[PDB]
């Protein structure tokens, strides 16, 4: 006997079964049993907060009206042009702000019906969630992108979502992000909305995301190092060479303001203050002031022995002070920013 | 009995009900209250003034043709696929540029008819909604997006629309935005449009958003300040050290130029003056005169007693006349933008 | 009586409406009274010459075949998902590159039919209209964007389209643009296609927008300025102090070219010279001429009392010649581009 | 009569005529005449190396089975609706990467069935056609993008495509565009395929594109040549004058330097060499030899009179040999890219 | 007879034939032979790490059911609009982000059905195909892209696919690409799933792409070697030329800034450390380092014979030390990313 009309036995008009009516109408939930594997991942923008996937995503029910025994084979597949015949999950990314379905070729549909009455039903789609992302601490940040399965129209009582025990989440080998270091360890949640109407099942997953460092660090933090270590070249310089020290001084506080402008297009647009800007920040104040320095010296020697010897100390005493209090100042920035401001993911 | 051959009943054939004709048909208009949930909200963009809305709209309204009392239930459903055998309001969005609704798993609609005739109707949506932003006053400034909920062709002794009184409009937690800050006050109004062809109902929210300082702060104005600080350390300088001054003088001007040009890819692109440009433009003639006030001094002292007197007065009263001046710059910019130009959001 | 069913026995199959045989069949041409409402107006792009609009477009006419007298109400509406049963003209905009319609929430179209027979068709649309700019005379451009209402398949002899007498086109208040002003005057005119078919009736809408100049004047026209008369300081400076005049110079120079170099990225991408192009290259060759009069200066004076008397009038000379002569060419510029450039926008 | 049952009848069921089957389906191929129209052309991108463009295309053949004699009228037109009740050739661009129709009022699609069974069948639609560009030589480069015509499923035997003889394709008047010039000349030609299947008809247009150069001259290779001028202004400095000749080097590469860089943005980005960047190179070459120059007579010089001759005739030698070894090189690059490397374009 | 009506018998109602059942439903499984054609190739991009194709799929299969003998004809087509009536494999790309298929003028699908048969299926269609990148070795990297054919719920003992013997994979002639060289070789890879449910056919391609290097090596590379060079001089310069010596290597420096700067905004945008960026790196640290040997002989020299002359040592080892330190750290480099980090495809 051929499966096609097996299927239209099974649920056509002589059995009348109504895919507007959930399997167990009268008494208990409909227990969805969900996994989500992971094709691809990227696409991750700050401009409008947001990320995208290529998922496939499984659910598997009981319908005990699509049992069968007279027909030989273990399984029957539902054509992917016919699936308005049964009824499915109203499941919905919560946090979705655009998705599709896959098309090219056949349907990237799939549909299976056990003998027990037991439905796997497995699809292929796109999507871009939305993730609220905090960049402050931008260089250092850590961020957690989320995946939320809701019912739509369907109360706790009616539908309930579970996520499957052995492995509900999994990411395909070899992905590999510009920006992230998608890591390992992905939380499995439970967040029950509770509105007016009553309890609405929710399942999620979160994702955990490291920033990579190595082009910050060896583009912009190293390269402002070196030009605050140049600007204290000038506390070695003679006392007497005005032109000397004044244009170190100032094609310091030149390059520190290119290094600061180049760096500006490739950082995020936001408009709050980060850890980079804090770093850029402080290495201008100090380029600055190794400049003020050399006018307070300058100033003070002509004043016609002691002011001689006056404007020397200040010298000898900027080559300690100056490179001691930058010191510190790495040193409260490193441990607020990798140690204190950085906490557990969870 | 089957809750959907009880709809086929109510609004089949037999009922002689029709989608295209009001409830109410002969006598008042039909009341449609409004609720808003927004999901998301971000992507607002100066060159296309606009921004972008995930939203929940609920609506709801009588329609004393779909009173039942024999069914025991006391609500129904209606399939998604089958909304258009009722009468829904043509309601629209006046200020909209592009929107779409979501499908991906089963339709994001939802309706419910009550035992009284009530209608619950709630549909999930993407907008893109215009709001003309004015940009003047650009670091310091406040803008209103709208949204307005309009009829396309019922009058209003047809079909008015209302917000709900408890909470029309609400906004899911922890959502962030690169530039902006949401504000917890919202707008609630009227916008009857009058026409030739009569009044036609038109509900509306004002969201309002206030940009963050921290960043133009950080790395505009105080390197810019820091910059026509440095400018001022000409006065200090010995007057027969012209190439030490002059250096000074023009590589400020260079430092100066390169901080606005590279500041110019960041800020929005329009063609009007903005209190950033006015900031920038005086930070520029304040480096531009203290070079000319070198070549002052420079030209009136070498005339061959008198002349090194009044040259090193020149220099003596710049010492205290350029701070003094930028400080009054400074209280009148600040207060004309924080406090005169500031004004009540309403 | 349902209007419906009147709708129904109006365009029945026993009525004979045949909604590809346009009204008045043998005789003379139907003629379509057009009004467009302009809700918003933007995305003005010079890269693929074109803008984008959001309108409201109403067509009026006759049809002697909708005459009703029996019905008692005035007016009757067509349902949007029945527009394939009733005539309607095949406009189309000739200068659209892409258009779509709007369908969320119901359709955005509305159609009454009034008992003379006079039919009202206003749909709400979205356009790209194609508008080649010119883009010399740059900062002090003005631009005409057209839009064009033509017929695809029917000669002149058989439809005629027509402005409405009393106000054809409308723009919303409160409209804005980041870079163009929208003058209120518009030109209603006849662009009527002559082919090899025949005349096709074409009505057209011109808009006048003129470029804002506020920003270009603050940020590029005045720091050149300075940057020019800055240029001008190393005549006042002493003959015999090379290194000044020479870093001050070259420094000129460079200042000139990272001021030209971070303007590049804001203006319009181009093959041809703007107007802002001559006033930039006018400027480097003044800082450019300026050090080139301080190298014969140089090379005049020492050849070792006549040689440097006659190296001091070089500079004397170029005290008044350089300003001199940077008078007549923004006399010159300013005269070229704001008033003989300058054209009546008909 | 009704021309719609008209058109029933000579294409209904008792017609027998099979819109699979093409005209003269046992003999002679069926010959296809094509015209193009374009009424907008660019969004030419190196980037994705393709064009855009907006065209009515018009084919003409004759079907035998539509020849009427009855009907009084010389011409029939079928509704857009229903054009898949008729045979069309199915021609397809061989180089689009994508293409739509229009849709917006009425569907932008005409066919016209004359008396002795010509079917003239005109179309509006976009397309996005792929180019393959050099961009070596690439100021002054020219580019040809092609638009082909094949079949998609006949072989020669079946289906030809002609040219029409006296006008196959026409250009819209008053098109402008950012980067290019549109030349009048246009290539018909003949790009017939031959593969495993057999000949399949296909027809070409070939489009001639030159870029315009006064932007390029203006922005680029004027300010870098009088850069270049203003490092051989050392060569008139006094040899003594070690901080203004090293530091007018210096800041020559400097200014070399931020005039490529800010260049860098603007140009095209490939991985290959560009006329323009052998250009940068060589002026870059030319302002770090004038600096080693003077390394070299400054090195000369001091070696404590027969070294100050020596390091004295390394100067007026230079001041002739740079300037002409410059203009030796302006002439063979001039001559290679704008007579040698210029080609015809057939 | 007509070859509509044959092709109405063979897979009409009478046949029984079942578009949802494979061919040899029983037994072995089918064998599907595949072909590629490649129009066109391009948009290779690092940020959302894939790239897009256009190509013609061609798959052969045999289908027993189909064999005909009654008609006169070889072979026979089947309407693209009537593909839903025969049973085709549910191929689909695995790595696909995004596809479409092509309808401008007719749907751009074939089908042929031979006597034995056997059928071929050829369809155009666009493709993006994700592709990780690694982009450390950045100017002189090679990536390798691959396109999967699986099928989606078909297990090999249902399905095969093989690649054709002959010629599996073509690229149209004249591509080319802005960054990318398409190597001609080609690797034809077996890729079998397996899962849970079963063994998954898929067949693979792998394309080779190696970058173009000589925009690289001309505008970055090499100016920086000369930046580096011109950094060597200060050790030719006397050692008491204090303003000369400073402010070279400071204006160095400077320039070594805006080089790398500018340079910035052209490089992907990874957040780890690529080659340039080691280049960039070690080319800063060499001008920072000539800057502090200068800082180190200006301090030993004044001390107040022996002072003078440890002070002109460090000055002598100095001009051979540099030099031979970084023609070290280039033979290293470019050893180590040319020929040890370089490896073979396979
Ligand atoms: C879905 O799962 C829930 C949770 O296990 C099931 O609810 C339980 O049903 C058993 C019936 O044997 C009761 O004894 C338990 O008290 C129920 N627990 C709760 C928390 O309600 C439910 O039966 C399942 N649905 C179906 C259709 O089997
Ligand atoms: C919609 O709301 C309006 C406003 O309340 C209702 O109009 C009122 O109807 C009552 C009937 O009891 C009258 O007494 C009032 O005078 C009406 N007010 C106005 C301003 O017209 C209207 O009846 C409501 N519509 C429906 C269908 O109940
Ligand atoms: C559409 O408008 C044209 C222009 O007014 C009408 O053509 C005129 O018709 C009147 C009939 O009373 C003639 O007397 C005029 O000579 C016509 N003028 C021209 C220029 O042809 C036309 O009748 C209108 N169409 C309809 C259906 O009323
Ligand atoms: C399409 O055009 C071709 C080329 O002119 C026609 O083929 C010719 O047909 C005539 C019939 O009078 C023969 O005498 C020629 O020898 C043919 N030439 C070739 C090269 O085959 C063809 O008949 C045309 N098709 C139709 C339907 O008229
Ligand atoms: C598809 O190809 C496979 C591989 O050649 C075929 O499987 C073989 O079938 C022959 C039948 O003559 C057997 O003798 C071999 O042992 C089979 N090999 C394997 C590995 O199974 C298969 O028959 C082909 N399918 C069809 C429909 O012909
Ligand atoms: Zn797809
Ligand atoms: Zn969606
Ligand atoms: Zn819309
Ligand atoms: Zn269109
Ligand atoms: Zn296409």
Redesign the interface.
Known sequence: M???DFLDKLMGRTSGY?A??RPNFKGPPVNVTCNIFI??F??IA????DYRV?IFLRQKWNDPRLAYSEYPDDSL?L?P?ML?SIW???????????????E???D?K?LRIFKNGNVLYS?????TL?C????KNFPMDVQTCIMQLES??YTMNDLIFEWQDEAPVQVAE???????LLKEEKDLRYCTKHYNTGKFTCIEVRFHLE??????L??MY??SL??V??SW?SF???MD????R???G??????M??????????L???????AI??W??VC??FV?SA??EY?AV??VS?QHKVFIDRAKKIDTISRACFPLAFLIFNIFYWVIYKILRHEDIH
Chains 1, 2, 3, 4, 5 share one sequence.
């Open positions: 051929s499966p096609s109504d507007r009516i094709n691809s990227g696409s700050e401009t409008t907060m290529n597949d054509d042009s308005d499915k999950p109203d499941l919905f990314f919560a946090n979705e702000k655009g998705a599709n379905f896959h090219v070729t056949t990237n799939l699809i292929r789609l796109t999507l939305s609220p992302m905090d960049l739509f129209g070899g992905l590999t992000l510009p920006q992230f920033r990579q460092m190595g082009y910050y060896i583009q190293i390269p070196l030009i270590i140049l070249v070695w310089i003679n060479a005005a032109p000397a004044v244009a170190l100032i094609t310091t506080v030149l390059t303001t290119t290094q600061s402008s180049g760096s500006r297009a490739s995020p647009k936001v408009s709050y203050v980060k800007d804090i850029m920040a201008l104040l600055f400049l003020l006018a300058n100033f002509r």
